[PDB]
């Protein structure tokens, strides 16, 4: 429980549930958003086997489970599994009663309507929270950024999206949503590791490839110069010990894995890339905003924890932007939590406390109340 009735912030973005109380600088519960179910028979009698394992426990027991992410591309697809994720979030990891704490859910912009409606329905009807508020995730990243002016991208596990904001005013006609993120980079890394000779196809082995992506991948500045550098010798080739076995040795896959985030034609996705959707999100704004966006380009979320993504980002945008502009890629080491941290700052505001969606008016109006009071 909690000594106070301080509001909860539950960032459940697409692939890593992180949650805690308001006023904290870091979430108290960080666990992957997986639901593992056993696919083999239980032969030992009276052990204490469960029906489904949730989160970090499913990450431990993954050798005898199948792992299902209940949320994909920022869209919740298994509502009973996501109910297990939230039940594990409040009752097991936080160990708190949700009937006493307001909750601040995060979504992605340009999401389905039934996502936020049914998420509101499960928050009020199943868990009985006193008040809730669903907010756009990159706006919250700009809260923890300490700025009221800037264009933001977060790049979670399922969705990257640019939200440009000038002087506190949202520019919703210029919000870009690109469904290319860390889970797609994990699948592409599974493909190119299959190219080298290491066949990972199991969902547990998919988590192994995710760990390879987190530990060994980095963003190149010039993809052909690093590509010919890896083609020259074994200078950048790095080895990784697999869980419970042998050692693999990966080469150019270190930078071919996140280059898909800049060149989405690698995974076959016709789009402009993360730098060009950032630049197009700047150019779809009004003109006298634009330099303040270039000086406050905020890259403060998830997947963008690669080494050298800020230099590549400033190189590509500075190549796209006109001269005599100051392009500043704000990329703090507070990333991968700053969408949550700005959730804590937004929940800790005094004037925000009228903007909560409570009971009684949800109970007056129904699940469309978010489309009244959320952005």
């Amino acid at each position: 429980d909690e000594d106070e009735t301080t509001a909860l912030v539950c960032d459940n973005g697409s692939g890593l549930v992180k949650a805690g109380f308001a006023g904290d600088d870091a979430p108290r519960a960080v666990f992957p958003s997986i639901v593992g179910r056993p696919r083999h028979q239980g032969v030992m009698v009276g052990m204490g086997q469960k029906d489904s394992y949730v989160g970090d426990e499913a990450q431990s027991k993954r050798g005898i489970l199948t792992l299902k992410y209940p949320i994909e591309h920022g869209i919740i697809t298994n509502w009973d599994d996501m109910e297990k994720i939230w039940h594990h979030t409040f009752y097991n990891e936080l160990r708190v009663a949700p009937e006493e704490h307001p909750t601040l859910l995060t979504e992605a912009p340009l999401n389905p309507k039934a996502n936020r409606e049914k998420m509101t329905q499960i928050m009020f009807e199943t868990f009985n929270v006193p008040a809730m508020y669903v907010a756009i995730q990159a706006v919250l990243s700009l809260y923890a950024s300490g700025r009221t002016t800037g264009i933001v991208l977060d790049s979670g596990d399922g969705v990257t999206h640019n939200v440009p904001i000038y002087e506190g005013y949202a520019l919703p006609h210029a919000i870009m949503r690109l469904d290319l993120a860390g889970r797609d980079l994990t699948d592409y890394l599974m493909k190119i590791l299959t190219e080298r000779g290491y066949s990972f196809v199991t969902t547990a082995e998919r988590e192994i490839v995710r760990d390879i992506k987190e530990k060994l991948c980095y963003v190149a500045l010039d993809f052909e110069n690093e590509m010919a550098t890896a083609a020259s010798s074994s200078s950048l080739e790095k080895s990784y010990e697999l869980p419970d076995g042998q050692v693999i040795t990966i080469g150019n896959e270190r930078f071919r894995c996140p280059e898909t985030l800049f060149q989405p034609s690698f995974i076959g996705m016709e789009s402009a890339g993360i730098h060009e959707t950032t630049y197009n999100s700047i150019m779809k704004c009004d003109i006298d905003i634009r330099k303040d966006l270039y000086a406050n380009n905020v890259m403060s979320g998830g997947t963008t924890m690669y080494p050298g993504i800020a230099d590549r980002m400033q190189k590509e945008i500075t190549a796209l932007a006109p001269s005599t502009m100051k392009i500043k890629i704000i990329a703090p080491p507070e990333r991968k939590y700053s969408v949550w941290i700005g959730g804590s700052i937004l929940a800790s505001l005094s004037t925000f406390q009228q903007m909560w969606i409570t009971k009684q008016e949800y109970d007056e109006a129904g699940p469309s109340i978010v489309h009244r009071k959320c952005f």
Partner: protein, 73 residues
Amino acid sequence: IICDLIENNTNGILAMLDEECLRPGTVTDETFLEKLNQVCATHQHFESRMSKCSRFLNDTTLPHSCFRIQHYA
């Protein structure tokens, strides 16, 4: 009424200055005084020159970058 004007968690002056120390962006003293001119205008005992409901606007004895509180003294 006075204590409430400073104590209140949603429009009190300590809550507004706690918010101004918390809220992002350009935080000066001028923006805090303008926030007090926004969220304490329809209060009886708050007194500032640039308040929106001000009957102390033409009060020449109130300098800018200042405000009055109607204490018992």
